[PDB]
Write a protein that binds this ligand. Sequence first.
Ligand SMILES: Nc1ncnc2c1ncn2[C@@H]1O[C@H](COP(=O)(O)OP(=O)(O)OP(O)(O)=S)[C@@H](O)[C@H]1O
Ligand SMILES: [Mg+2]
Length: 1173
Amino acid sequence: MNVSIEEFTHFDFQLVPEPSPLDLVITESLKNHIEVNGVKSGALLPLPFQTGIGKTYTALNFLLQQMLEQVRSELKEEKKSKRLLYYVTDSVDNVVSAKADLLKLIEKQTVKGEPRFTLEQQEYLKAQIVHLPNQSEQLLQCSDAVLNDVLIGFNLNAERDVQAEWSAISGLRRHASNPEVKISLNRQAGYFYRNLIDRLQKKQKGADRVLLSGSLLASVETLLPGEKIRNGSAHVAFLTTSKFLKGFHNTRSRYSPLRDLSGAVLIIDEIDKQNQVILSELCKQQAQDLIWAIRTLRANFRDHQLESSPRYDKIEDLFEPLRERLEEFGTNWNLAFAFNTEGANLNERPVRLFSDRSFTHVSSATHKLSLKSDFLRRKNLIFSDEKIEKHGLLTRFVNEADVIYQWFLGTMRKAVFQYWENVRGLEIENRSLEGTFQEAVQSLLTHFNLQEFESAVYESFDTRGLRANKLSSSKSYHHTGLKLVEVAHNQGTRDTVNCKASFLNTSPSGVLADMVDAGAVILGISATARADTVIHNFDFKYLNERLGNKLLSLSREQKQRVNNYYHSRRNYKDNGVVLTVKYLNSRDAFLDALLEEYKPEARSSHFILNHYLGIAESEQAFVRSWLSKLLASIKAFISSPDNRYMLSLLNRTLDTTRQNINDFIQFCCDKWAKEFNVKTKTFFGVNADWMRLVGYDEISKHLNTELGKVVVFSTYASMGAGKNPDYAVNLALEGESLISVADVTYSTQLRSDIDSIYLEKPTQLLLSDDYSHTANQLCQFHQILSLQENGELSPKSAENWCRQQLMGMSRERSLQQYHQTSDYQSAVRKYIEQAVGRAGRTSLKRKQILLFVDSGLKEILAEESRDPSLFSHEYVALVNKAKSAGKSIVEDRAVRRLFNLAQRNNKDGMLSIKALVHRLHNQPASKSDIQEWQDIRTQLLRYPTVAFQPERFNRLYLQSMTKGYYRYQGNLDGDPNSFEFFDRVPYGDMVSEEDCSLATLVQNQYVRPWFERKGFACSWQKEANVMTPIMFTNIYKGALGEQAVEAVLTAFDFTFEEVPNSIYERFDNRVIFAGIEQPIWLDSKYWKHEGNESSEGYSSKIALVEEEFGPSKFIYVNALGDTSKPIRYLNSCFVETSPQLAKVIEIPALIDDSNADTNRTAVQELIKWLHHS
DNA sequence: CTTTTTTTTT
Ligand SMILES: Nc1ncnc2c1ncn2[C@@H]1O[C@H](COP(=O)(O)OP(=O)(O)OP(O)(O)=S)[C@@H](O)[C@H]1O
Ligand SMILES: [Mg+2]
């Protein structure tokens, strides 16, 4: 019988425990956030304080306060749904330890000497918390009575194979032998759980819906903990990040928490380590054949229609542009035919193409691959011509098909949300977006006959249940992604190819920002929450720019209060605590004697390693160093009399697979144990599985009931963060070496932490993915593009690394390339600081603490430069000891990031401008493309220099060391990867206001009123965000010349009309004067300089204009120049001729560059020329 | 030249 909430009626909710400074840090920031933003808006609050200061105890006390607030709210409401609280972390052990810590807090919390909650209140509060493990673990913890009750209650017993499967599972349960049986039991438990829940859900969705209550309800709630969430019995969930990204099950469907994040509270512990976890999920997506997908979309969108019912209101207007695009794409690329390759170098190896989707494009083909349609053969052939043919490239087709596919998935998201709006105002049970999502997708795909995209629609919603590439939007790798396309022959046939494409549509930082934008309030708890790496942490410069004030910050008063709290509870210096740090090299001569004593019947230790320990010849140069620093640390710890607890953090786990090595290590320990008269217990293979099966409490039990030393062998992946290695202290076994460092004792029990640590250098710091080859390729390209996006890599180095990655470089060559970045050193120092923070859990410390660190870490630790006010005592001592050698000359990270980000922004601008011009030079043009081109021109004219970091045209500007001007070198029509900027080029072209001659131009009497009326800037602000060289040379000066010419001509009574999109961008604008039947076009330039306007180009422009518009006149005028030069008259072939026959009039200048005086003579000549037509 | 373990569904 459930506990009623009416037991909290007499509870006094206004009596609360004393809030610590950490509690005030969370509460004041969240209350202020609600004051500033809305009540429904999301937030992200990182809490980057010292390790061991008590940030999980504070997160669980904040969760308990949220549960009490919810109980109070529903007590007064005596309908509002429960607000969901999530506790997420990477490791299962930290999930179960935090749940047991919250339950312990509920059990034995005290207020003024009396328990805060009665036993019935405690049982209700505990009933509000659930834990959601993997499906095999969920099934294996259900007793036979529960599962037989579930099978009986759903009439699932008599269904053939299901009972056959269940009878097998219970059999394996009864005789659970050594782990050999257990791996099989786990695999079959997970498969049976999936099948059973699938049939339970299909039974609950149909008309034969079973009524759940009493025993049946308690059993199904035991089998399905998410059924408690769906009912409303519980609203607190403890789970991992993988489970949170996958979702859980109830009796109806699978609940995805990412689709229902509005109003939720997420507590993410060790948030930085979740960056890689989310990444490993994004790389699991399934590849899609783009040729089949686009041919299916074209075939089914041709005629199929939606219903004209109210529930499908204004959904077809979402899909009409996609239908027009599909019909145009299929006409252009001849999608009636299939695709095949031909020629050499195309059959031996498949073709691989990589695209950033903005400006990084790498092809595995030596020559550019073309695409031609053979109407006699009825085939599309991927040729390699041995002779730029812009029309008919394979990369153009692949990019346009990826654009169309992502357009279809985006319009599916838009139409599902529109369906849910139509339903909520029509259907008038689950009336939310998450509950209507499956029916909306099913109805739309069934109506369009596109049910084969159903899985694709679901996963795209899974990745993008929280939600462009235009130089007018904010651009970033984190919301666009990357794409990897493989073109290979179809499996089974020898005459067709397919384009399997794998996409990353967002980065982990984009997912986190989408989560905050959806309305979630997220508490990010980690000491390394603000590490300066983008591989082992989120990009917080991107998150700061995107979230704005939703990224809650902590004032210096609050940080000083937290620092005072930490230094008050960790007073090492006043209490006589001394910690010694040793940087241990490789002592081969010391390992030679120990190896000789181990097996004294052999002469050469090479034979001992090669035969007994099982180490080959490729090793024995590496193993002899990590099995020598480890032994020197263990010997130095055993020689220490007072120290009792040692932890050794390596990169590899010492388990049965390395049993022979353990035999050597155990022998060495026993040799030392008898020499110094101490008892030593060694714990090997302490990994996640050992923690689930055996449990870390055994180590603590050993330290509590037995005297002697203990050495533990774990890794960074198991004990690096979150783990709370503690043991109960009995003064009889601890001697007299323990002392309290807190000024005021704050602990009920007596506990101590590790007193000796050995820290290896972390090794495999570039992330990898063993799921498949495609997943590892996506993870490597994501890490290269994140390093290019941050600024740690120049665009040419990232392009070269992406080319070597497409060519198939080795993991050791990726690791070599990553070791040259400062990201690697910030990741190394983040891992070291987190690992060293495992020895600072309690206030009962040994008088001496021994730290033994790999000597191959000293130079890295020597380059710490952050504020030491946030470090812990062990990390401050590690840094001070490594720094004791002094300071080494290093390059400032900000100056190199500025050089890289200037190169990046300039290359992005060049590629985007070229693609914009290509789209403009296409018949017919587009309204959006013209609008975007105009928006760029007006923005650069109005704001040629901005003060704050731009949020819409961020790629038009670079940040310079000078103010309002900078120097550069590079060919504007050459390689974007060869540009140099700032101080690297002391002599080079300048991007400055005076170089543009703006002041001389505006001195004209007609320029100022036109500029001021239009709002354009007449001067350059002195700010550090200046235009890139491409924007300055190509776009800004052209618009400035065109605007000056139009201003003076309009002052001379010239009316202007918009150029039609058929011939857009080919000429500046129209010309109408006094009324002439013949059309007149105008082309305007800023100054004379050099112009790629040879006779062939002019003839092409005239032919393309006169073809669709007949004969016409043409004016070609330079805005600035010498008025002494004579006005010219040239024919259509740019040849001097008589005025009576010439079709083109040329004006050398319209505004003088010496006094800014208008050319009245030129206007009079133009008047006479026009009147003489 | 570098030198792995971790969660989940399948
Ligand atoms: N004010 C407090 N009262 C009682 N116990 C506390 C208090 N603060 C912390 N503790 C306990 O002391 C230890 C501090 O550990 P946590 O609170 O887990 O540390 P942390 O600061 O979160 O460090 P992390 O998670 O490794 S980076 C835990 O065992 C807490 O349960
Ligand atoms: Mg924690």
